[PDB]
Amino acid sequence: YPIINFTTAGATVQSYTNFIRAVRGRLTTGADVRHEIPVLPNRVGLPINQRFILVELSNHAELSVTLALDVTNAYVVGYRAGNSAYFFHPDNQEDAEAITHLFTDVQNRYTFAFGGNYDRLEQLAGNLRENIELGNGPLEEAISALYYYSTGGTQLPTLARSFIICIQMISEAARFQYIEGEMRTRIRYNRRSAPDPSVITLENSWGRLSTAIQESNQGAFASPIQLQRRNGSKFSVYDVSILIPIIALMVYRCAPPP
Numbered sequence: 707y708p709i710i711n712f713t714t715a716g717a718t719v720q721s722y723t724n725f726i727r728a729v730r731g732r733l734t735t736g737a738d739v740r741h742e743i744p745v746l747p748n749r750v751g752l753p754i755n756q757r758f759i760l761v762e763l764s765n766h767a768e769l770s771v772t773l774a775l776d777v778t779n780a781y782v783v784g785y786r787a788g789n790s791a792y793f794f795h796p797d798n799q800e801d802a803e804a805i806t807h808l809f810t811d812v813q814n815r816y817t818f819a820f821g822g823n824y825d826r827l828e829q830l831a832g833n834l835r836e837n838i839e840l841g842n843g844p845l846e847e848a849i850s851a852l853y854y855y856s857t858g859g860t861q862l863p864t865l866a867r868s869f870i871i872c873i874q875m876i877s878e879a880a881r882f883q884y885i886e887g888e889m890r891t892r893i894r895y896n897r898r899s900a901p902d903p904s905v906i907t908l909e910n911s912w913g914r915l916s917t918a919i920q921e922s923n924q925g926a927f928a929s930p931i932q933l934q935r936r937n938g939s940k941f942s943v944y945d946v947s948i949l950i951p952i953i954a955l956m957v958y959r960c961a962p963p964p
Contacts, residue, residue: 707757707808708732709772713764714846719890729880730954732759733777740962741925741946745916748958749778754807758783761876765846769853773872774808776801779957780877782822782869789813790856794822814856822869824909830866835874835906840889841898844871874901878909884952885909903934908952916956919946 710732712725730744738745747756759777764770772786774793783805784793791809795818796802809815820826828834838844848868851860860868879886885905892899901909908915911931918927922945930942943949 707760709760709762711762714842715766717842717893719894722890722893726879726886733780734955740920742950743953743956745956745958747777757804758808763849765849767850769850771849771852780880782873782877785852786812787853787856791815793817795820827866827870830862831870832863836900838867838870839898839900840871840874841892843898845875848872881912881955882908882952883954902936903938904936907934915953917959920959922946
């Protein structure tokens with residue numbers, strides 16, 4: 707499976723940008739595009755040899771971890787740290803069988819009983835996304851946390867918090883240039899900060915947005931979608947046009963019309 711590398715050690719806006727750009731290139735072929743927005747591969751009939759991509763994260767502490775992302779939704783399905791790999795609770799028999807194709811040579815394999823969805827992770831973390839700082843420092847720390855979990859150096863709440871950081875800085879950034887932009891800002895000024903409502907709402911609305919766009923009539927939504935500004939004020943999206951600079955990838959929702 708394709709591997710993309712990134713390190714928090716000496717990270718810059720440019721190195722982070724190249725990284726996210728590479729992730730997007732491995733996530734989608736670039737064949738399916740709608741109203742200028744790339745669509746991730748349809749999971750139906752997708753060969754298992756093209757189902758995942760690996761993201762190896764390293765940090766200043768010289769510690770590395772490898773996350774496994776599902777190309778059909780950009781989810782982080784699990785990770786390997788040394789001789790141990792951990793997977794989030796599979797959701798269907800298909801996903802359960804699919805992850806056995808990852809890190810096939812790790813000595814110890816484990817499957818968590820919980821999922822990687824935010825509601826769950828925030829619950830185990832004891833903190834909501836809005837109270838979890840993001841940036842290069844948090845990422846660097848998240849990597850170490852993930853690394854020492856198997857040896858008992860990381861408590862579950864910290865592990866969950868770490869997943870929340872990685873998922874947003876990798877998967878969400880890949881999905882939205884607007885969140886990749888938020889992370890670029892954090893790196894550029896070396897400031898760690900929790901995601902504002904604009905980031906939070908985009909993250910929660912990815913599925914709805916992907917579907918609205920794909921089912922739109924020549925780009926116009928049948929029903930508007932409500933997002934939030936940085937100050938938390940509400941604003942409506944009635945067309946795909948306004949999302950072009952915001953969403954970089956969509957989950958496959960339907961076949962494109964003639």
